[PDB]
Amino acid sequence: DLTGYLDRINYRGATDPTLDVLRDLVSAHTGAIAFENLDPLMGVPVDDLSAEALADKLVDRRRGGYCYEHNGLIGYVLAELGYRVRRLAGRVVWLAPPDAPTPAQTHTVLAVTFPGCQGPYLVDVGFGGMTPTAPLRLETGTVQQTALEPYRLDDRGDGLVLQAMVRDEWQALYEFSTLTRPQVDLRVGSWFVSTHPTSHFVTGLMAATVADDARWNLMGRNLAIHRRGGTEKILLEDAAAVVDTLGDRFGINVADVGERGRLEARIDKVCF
């Protein structure tokens, strides 16, 4: 802690708080720690947002987690490296209507600065399927390239909206204030998302990771692989198959959950 972590993400690795080092960290982290909701899905809330609790889960126990766990963790880490970290909250609007009941603030992201930096950067290793896998400049109007899809920040409110080009369209991901939010608001937001019985993190399975050079997205028993925009689709045949995929492909420590019969029947109910 940090050698636990820098080793878990396989970064090796210079540690000075520079732009180069921020890009490489965000790259290794998103390549090694899957987005997943196995806990909420198993009726285990995500409540404790401390460095010790998140480190224990996403590093020592070799699990993934969601936005609060991912951006919680990588935030304690950059802080330690001597980056300056502000936590922000956001509402998710990915594939929202029209229809749109205003969404809850169920997302958290980071505004990061460092010595001699050219302005703030946005860090979000916890969105899931569409997470930006590079730090983005906290500036509006500029189209910003990554190893995968391009990103753009626009004014909305009061706040910003992050969009990404997917296929032949700009799609909105989440809206957010640049105001710092206290840890306690993050914890309230996490309680909601992990325990509210109509939460999609409670009622279905979702996983995401990046294995080169592509998004591997799991939603139920549907696995989508987006490489260079092209989507390949795999329908997993049974719950045993999905648990195996979570273990091999998504590199999650499934026994940590961790009676495989019990995970398999939740998956089967869910699912299935």
Ligand X SMILES: CC(C)(COP(=O)(O)OP(=O)(O)OC[C@H]1O[C@@H](n2cnc3c(N)ncnc32)[C@H](O)[C@@H]1OP(=O)(O)O)[C@@H](O)C(=O)NCCC(=O)NCCS
Beta partners for residue 168, in sequence order: none
* One residue of 2, 211, 224, 241 binding ligand X per CB under 6 A: 224
Contacting range for ligand X; rule: CB under 6 A; set: 39-47, 72-80, 218-226, 263-271: 218-226
In the complex, the smallest distance separating the C-beta of residue 219 from ligand X, rounded to whole angstroms, is: 4
29 a catalytic residue: no
Query: Considering CB under 6 A, how many residues would be counted as binding ligand X?
Result: 22
Residues 61-120 contacting ligand X, CB under 6 A: 66-67, 92, 94, 106-107
- CA-based nearest residue to 219, from 125, 129, 104, 87: 129
Burial class of residue 98 in the structure, from the number of CB atoms within 10 Å of its CB (0-12 exposed, 13-18 middle, 19+ buried): exposed
- Select 129 or 135, whichever has its Cβ closest to ligand X: 129
10 binds ligand X (CB under 6 A): no
* Identified binder of ligand X from the candidate list 129, 132, 135, 189, rule CB under 6 A: 129
Q: What's the chain's Rg over C-alpha atoms?
A: 18
Calculate the CA 178 to chain-centre distance.
19
Cβ atoms of 219 and 225 within 8 Å: the answer is no
Taking the least distance from each CB to ligand X, the nearer of 113 and 272 is 272
In this complex, which beta carbon is closest to ligand X, that of residue 103 or of residue 113? 103
Q: Nearest approach, Cβ of 2 to ligand X (angstroms)?
A: 24
Nearest residue to 34 (alpha-carbon basis) of 60, 80, 69:
69
Give the interface segment with ligand X, choosing from 16-24, 75-83, 96-104, 225-233 (CB under 6 A): 225-233
Q: Maximum Cα–Cα distance for the chain, whole Å?
A: 53
CB of 260 to ligand X, least distance (A): 22
Q: How far is the CB of 198 from ligand X (least distance, A)?
A: 14
- Active site (annotated) includes residue 67: yes
Q: How far is CA 113 from the centre of its chain?
A: 20
Shortest Å, Cβ 148 to ligand X: 7
Measured CA to CA in angstroms, residue 64 lies from 96, 118, 208 at distances of 26, 32, 9
Q: Burial level of 58, CB count in 10 A (0-12/13-18/19+)?
A: buried
Told to check if 231 binds ligand X by CB under 6 A, we report yes
- Near ligand X by CB under 6 A: residue from 76, 127, 176, 250: 127
Q: How far is the CB of 250 from ligand X (least distance, A)?
A: 11
**Of 229, 240, 258, 262, which one interacts with ligand X (CB under 6 A)?**
229
**29, 67, 70, 226: which is the annotated catalytic residue?**
67
Q: How far apart are CA 161 and CA 134, in angstroms?
A: 17
Phi, psi (5° rounding) for residue 144?
-115, 120
Question: Residues of 177-201 as b/e, b for ≥16 C-beta within 10 angstroms?
Answer: eeeebeeeebbebbeebbbeeebeb
Catalytic residue IDs:
67, 107, 124
Which residues contact ligand X (rule: CB under 6 A)? 35, 66-67, 92, 94, 106-107, 127-129, 149, 166-167, 206, 208, 215, 217, 219, 224, 226, 229, 231
